[PDB]
Design a protein around this ligand. Structure first.
Ligand SMILES: NCCc1ccc(O)c(O)c1
Ligand SMILES: NCCc1ccc(O)c(O)c1
Ligand SMILES: NCCc1ccc(O)c(O)c1
Ligand SMILES: NCCc1ccc(O)c(O)c1
Ligand SMILES: [Fe+3]
Ligand SMILES: [Fe+3]
Ligand SMILES: [Fe+3]
Ligand SMILES: [Fe+3]
Lengths: 335, 18, 335, 335, 335, 18, 18, 18
C-alpha cells in the first residue's frame, strides 16, 4: 500500500520535501521565452515552495501586464457567464465580486479568497509550482484543501493557457467549489483516493477531469455547465453548449474508461441533473473500488483516521450518535 | 493534461519496479 | 433574546467593537505601580485589540524579568505536577514540552500552541485585554476557541496573580483542553450558552469555574485534580488534595447555586470520576434549561446554525446519516 | 382528514362493522349460476366476516372440484414458472412447496402460510368477502398484513378469473411478498396511504396495480416479471414477455396517471432493475405527497403512532439510537 | 459455545423435546397430597407440554376451590396495592381489570392477557410444566415472550406458594412487564443471555431475581416496589417497605455476587430511581460480559440474527438508517 | 379492477358530500 | 428459587463433563 | 472572579433596563 497522509501537517512537509529542487521548464510551450516570465516564475515558485501550513498566504504584487491581461479575460467572462453557465455560479460570482473583490481594476489575492471559503465553505488555498503528481493533488483534495498556483497565463495567449494558471482556478475552480453540495461532492472524490492503487488513481482523476473540470448540469429545465475548464475558456463556452460536441448522461464507470484529448476542444461531455445524483453514483463507484481499508475524515482536527479494524470504527461512533443525541435538544426545545 | 499526469505515473513507477 | 454570534467572523468584529477604547486600570491591585508594567500592558493591549481572525498571532518579545519569573513558576510546577495532578495532564505536558517547547529557558509564544491544538484538538487562541464580560467569553468558548491573554503576573507576586495571566492558562487551561474528551466537554458548556438569559449565563459560568477552573477527577483508584485554577497555583495544589477543604461528588444543579470566594483558598470542590459522567450531566442540565431555540455546531465551516424550525433540523440531517452511510464502506471493506 | 386505523385491533372491528351485511352478487359475471358456488360463498363469507384478529384461521374443507381445478392450474404454472419468471419466485416457490406444502394433491390452507410468513417475512393473512374498498385494503397493507380470500375461481373458467381468488394470491401475491426487500417495498406503499386524500388513494393503488400486480424486474441481464397478476395467469405470462406489449422503465409519477383496461391483456408495463430502485422512487413520491402529518410503524406492538408534533418524533427516537447504541456491542465484541 | 435458539419456532420444538416425559413430583412440599391436585397437574401439564407456537392458548376451566382461593388473594391485594406499590402498577392494574377482566368473580385466562400485551406491549404467554432450567427460560425471555404456568398455589397455603404459580405472575409479573420501559428493560436481560456461559447465566438470573422479582423504585419522592415477587405476596409487602430489611442502591455487578435465601423473607433489596438508570447499567454490565459474538433482535420476524462478522452488522444497517430516512418525512411534512 | 375500485370511491363520496 | 435453578445447573453440567 | 464577572452583569443590565 502506497503511503498516504493523515493530517494537514504532513501534507506540507513531505509533499514539498519529495518535490524539492524542481523548476518548471516549459520552454517549448507557447510563449515562455521572455525573461520576465522566468523571473516571475522564480518569485512564484519561491513563495509556493517554502510556504508552510497555518501561515497566511504571502501577498504577491502584480505589475501592469498581468492586470492588463486580467482586464481582458475578466471583462469577457462576466458578459458571457450570464448565459450558458450554471446557476450556482451566478449568485456565487456576485457574492465573490462584492465581498472578495472580483473586479477588473483589482486583481484578487489568495488570502482574501482563502479566508472567504473557510468562512462559509471550508476550503483553503495552497500555492505550488513544478509538476503536480496525481497522488499529491488528490491527497490535498481529500483534506478539503485545493492546491493552487498564483501565476497566470502568458500575455501572448490570453485566450487559452497551456497549463492551468491563477485565473483559471479563481474563475473556473473557486466559484464552483464554494458550494455546499459540490464541496461535499469534491471531498468524496478525494476520500476514495486515500491509498488507492495507481490504476485507481487514474480513474477518479479522469472523473475529476470529467466532472469538476468539464461537467454539465440540468437545472431549471435547460442544461448548464459547471466544469472548471468549461467556465475558464472563452472558445470552450461557445463550443460547450453548441450542437457539435456529443453530450451524454454522466456515468462513473463509463467516464473512467473513456479517453481524452489535448490542445483541442472536447467532443464528449457528461451531464448530471443534480449534484445529489453526482455524489451518490461515485459513492457506489467507491463501493466497488477494493481497498485493504477505508478512510474517515475528522473536521474537528482536519485529519484522517484509518479504518482497518472495527475498533477504529468505534472512535468515530460517539461522534456519530452525538448529533442524534444533540438532535434531541433541537427537536425537544422546539414546539 | 491531468490524465497525462496519470499517464506519467506508471512507466516511472513500473521502471522503478523493473 | 440577546444577540449572539453565529460565525467566527463576528466573534472578532463586534466583540472588539463593543469593547473599544477600554484600558485596564488595576491600580489598587497588588503591584501594577511600575511604569514598565503599564507600558507592557499598552503593547499587550495593542496586539490583542487590533487582532483579526485568520491572522497569525503577532509574536511578542519577552525581556529578562518575565522569563526570570517564568523560570521560577515553571520549575516549581513540574516537580509538583508529577504528584497530585490528573493523568491526562502528564502525557499532555510531556507532549507539549517536547513539541511546543514548554521549557524554562524559552517562554512559549501563542502561534506555536495555537498551531499545535488545532493540529490535534481543534482550539485556537485569541489575545484580549480589558474586562472580559461573561457573554463574550462564552461565545468564544462555544466556537471551540479559547480567549486568552499574553501578559503575565507581576514579579512582586509570582506565587499568585490577581487576574488570570498568560502562564495561568498555558499551564492551567491549555494542558487540560488539549484532551479529546474535555474539549468536547468544554464545547458542550459553550453550546448551551448561546442566547441564554443572564440568569442562565451565571449558572454555567459558575459550572465553568467549578468544573474547568477547579475540578477533581477519580482515576486509577485515587482522586486527582484537573481544574485550570487548581493546576495554576502552588499553594492551591497543596491545599487542593489536603484534608482541610470539603470534597463532594459533582452535581450540575448543585454547583450552579453554591457560592464562591475571592483572594482565599476554596474549601468546596466537585469530583467527577469520568469525563463521560461530566459531559452527560450538564447535558441533562441543558435539557431543563429553557430556550426559544437550540444551537448546532458545524465544524466544516466553524459556524453556528440556529434551530427554531424543524426545517433547520433538516440541513443538519444529510450530514448526520452521511457517516451512517460512510460507515458502510468502513464496515463493508473490512473483513 | 379521513379516519385511519392505528392498531391491528381496529383494523378488524370497524372495517368489518362498516362492511356488515353485504353479500357478493356477481350474477352477471361468467359462471356463478351454480347453486353450489352460492352455498360455498356463504360458507366462505361466514368464515371471513366473523373472524377476529389473533384467532387462528378456521380451516376450510375442499371437495373434489376445487382441488381438481387446483390440479390444473398448479401443474401448468410450475412447468412455466421455470421460465419468464422472477428469480426471487424460484427459491421461494421451492421453499414454499417443500415446507408449506404447495402441491397438486394437497390444497394449501391459510394458517400454514400465515405461520410461515411471520416466521420469516412478517405478513399475516386475513379472510374477507364482499367489495373491498380502496381504503380498507391499504390500511391492512400498511400494517404488514395482506387481506385475502379463501374461495377460488369458477370451474367453468379456470384459465382466468373475473375477480382475484385464493389461488391468485397464494400463487401471485404470497410468493412475491415473502421477500425481505419486497415486503419492505410493499409496506412503504401502505405507509404513505395513511389518511391520504381520495385523489392520492387512487395514485398509489394504481402504483400497487402497476408494481405489485404487474411489475417487471431486470436481473441476471435478462428481464423478468414479478407482478402478482403477471404470475397468476397462463396467457398473461406468454403475453407479458412477448414483443407485442409496450415495456418502459418504471416511474412513480408516470405510473400514477397512465390508465388501465379490464377483461383484456395489458399492453403497458413498468420495469425496475432493482427493488432498491423500486423503494426509493415512491419514497420520493411520498415526499411530494402533501399530508397534515406523517406516519411511523412500530413493530414491537404492530401499531401506528401519528406524527403531527415534534414531540411524537421523540418517542420514536430512543428506539432509533437504541441500535446505534446496541451496534456498539456487536462492533465492540467483534475482533 | 452452548446452543441457543434464533427463532420462536425452535423455542417450542426443541425446548419441549429436551424436556419431554418429565412430571413434577413436589411430594415433600407443603400440600400436594390431595389427588385432585395431582389430577389437575396432569391436565395442566398436558395443555402446556403439547402446546405449539402460533396456536391460541387452550382455555382451561376452573372449579370452585381455585376461584374461591382466587377470591381471597385478589381481594387482599387490591386493598393493599393502593399503598406501598409502584406507580406504573396502578394505572396498569386498573387498565388490566377493566379490559382484560381482572376481577374476583372471574378468573382470567391466558389468551385474553396474551392478546392484550402484544396489542400494546408485545409479550406473549406460554404454558410450561416441570423443572424450568435457567437457559430455557432466558431464551424465552430474550424473544420478548414470558414463560408461564396456568395452575395456582395450594389451597392449604394461599398466603405463600412453594413455587411461582399462575396468580403469582398474572399479579406480580404481568402487571409489571406491560410497561414500555420495563419490557425494553426485561428484553435487555434476555438479549445478553444468548449463548452466555453457565457462570454468566447465573449472574443475570440473580439480577432477574434481584431486579424483576424483587426491585425497588424511587418516584414521586417516596420509594416504591416493582418486584414481581414483591407484588405477589401479602406478608412480603408489609416487610418490603418496613424498616427491618436493608435497602441499598441498585448495582449490576454488586447484585451479581450477593447471595439469596429461601422460604424466608429477604433482608437485602436494590432500588432504582428510574428504569432508564436500570437499563443502561446492566447495559454496561453486558459490555464487560465477554462473548465470541453479539446478538440483535429483529421485530419484523421475531427472530435473532447472530453477530460474529461485520457483514452480519450490514443486514441490520439499512433498517437502522431506514428510520433516519423515514424521520425525514415526519420532520419534513411537519411545519 | 382495483382502479375501478378507485373509480367507485368518489361519486359515492362526492354525492354523499353533494 | 431460580438461583437454586442456577445452582442445579453446574454439578449436572460438570459431572456430565467429568 | 468570573462569578463576580457574572455579578457585574445585571445591575448594569437592569439599571439600563430601569
Ligand atoms: N495536477 C493536474 C493538473 C491540473 C491542476 C489544476 C487544475 O485546475 C487542472 O485542471 C489540472
Ligand atoms: N381490493 C382490490 C381488488 C383486488 C384485491 C386483491 C388482489 O390481489 C387484486 O389484484 C385486486
Ligand atoms: N424458572 C425459574 C423459577 C421461576 C419461574 C417463574 C417465576 O416468576 C419465578 O419468580 C421463578
Ligand atoms: N473572563 C472571566 C475571567 C477569567 C478569564 C480567564 C480565566 O482562565 C479565568 O479563570 C477567569
Ligand atoms: Fe483546472
Ligand atoms: Fe483561569
Ligand atoms: Fe391480485
Ligand atoms: Fe416470579
Amino acid at each position: 500500500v502506497p503511503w498516504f497522509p493523515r493530517k494537514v501537517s504532513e501534507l506540507d512537509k513531505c509533499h514539498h520535501l519529495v518535490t524539492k529542487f524542481d523548476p518548471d521548464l516549459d520552454l517549448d510551450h507557447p510563449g515562455f521565452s521572455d525573461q520576465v516570465y522566468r523571473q516571475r516564475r522564480k518569485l512564484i515558485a519561491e513563495i509556493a515552495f517554502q510556504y508552510r501550513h497555518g501561515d497566511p498566504i504571502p501577498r504577491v504584487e502584480y505589475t501592469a501586464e498581468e492586470i492588463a491581461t486580467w482586464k481582458e479575460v475578466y471583462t469577457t467572462l462576466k458578459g458571457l457567464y450570464a448565459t450558458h453557465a450554471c446557476g450556482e455560479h451566478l449568485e456565487a460570482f456576485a457574492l465573490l465580486e462584492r465581498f472578495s473583490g472580483y473586479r477588473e481594476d483589482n486583481i484578487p489575492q489568495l488570502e482574501d479568497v482563502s479566508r472567504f471559503l473557510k468562512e462559509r465553505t471550508g476550503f483553503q488555498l495552497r500555492p505550488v509550482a513544478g509538476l503536480l503528481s496525481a497522488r499529491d493533488f488528490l491527497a490535498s483534495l481529500a483534506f478539503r484543501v485545493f492546491q493552487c498556483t498564483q501565476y497566470i497565463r502568458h500575455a501572448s495567449s490570453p485566450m487559452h493557457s497551456p497549463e492551468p494558471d491563477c485565473c483559471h482556478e479563481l474563475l473556473g475552480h473557486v466559484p464552483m467549489l464554494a458550494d455546499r453540495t459540490f464541496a461535499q461532492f469534491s471531498q468524496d472524490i478525494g476520500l476514495a483516493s486515500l491509498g488507492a492503487s495507481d490504476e485507481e488513481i487514474e480513474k477518479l482523476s479522469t472523473l475529476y477531469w470529467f466532472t469538476v473540470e468539464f461537467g454539465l448540469c440540468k437545472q431549471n429545465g435547460e442544461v448548464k455547465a459547471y466544469g472548471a475548464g468549461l467556465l475558464s475558456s472563452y472558445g470552450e463556452l461557445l463550443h460547450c453548449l453548441s450542437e457539435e460536441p456529443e453530450i451524454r448522461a454522466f456515468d462513473p464507470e463509463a467516464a473512467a474508461v473513456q479517453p481524452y484529448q489535448d490542445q483541442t476542444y472536447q467532443s464528449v461531455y457528461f451531464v448530471s441533473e443534480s449534484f445529489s445524483d453526482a455524489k451518490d453514483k461515485l459513492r457506489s463507484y467507491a463501493s466497488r473500488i477494493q481497498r485493504p481499508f477505508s478512510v474517515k475524515f475528522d473536521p474537528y482536527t482536519l485529519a484522517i483516521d484509518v479504518l482497518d479494524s472495527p475498533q477504529a470504527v468505534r472512535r468515530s461512533l460517539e461522534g456519530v450518535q452525538d448529533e442524534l443525541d444533540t438532535l434531541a435538544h433541537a427537536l425537544s426545545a422546539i414546539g | 493534461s491531468l490524465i497525462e499526469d496519470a499517464r506519467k505515473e506508471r512507466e516511472a513507477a513500473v521502471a522503478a519496479a523493473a
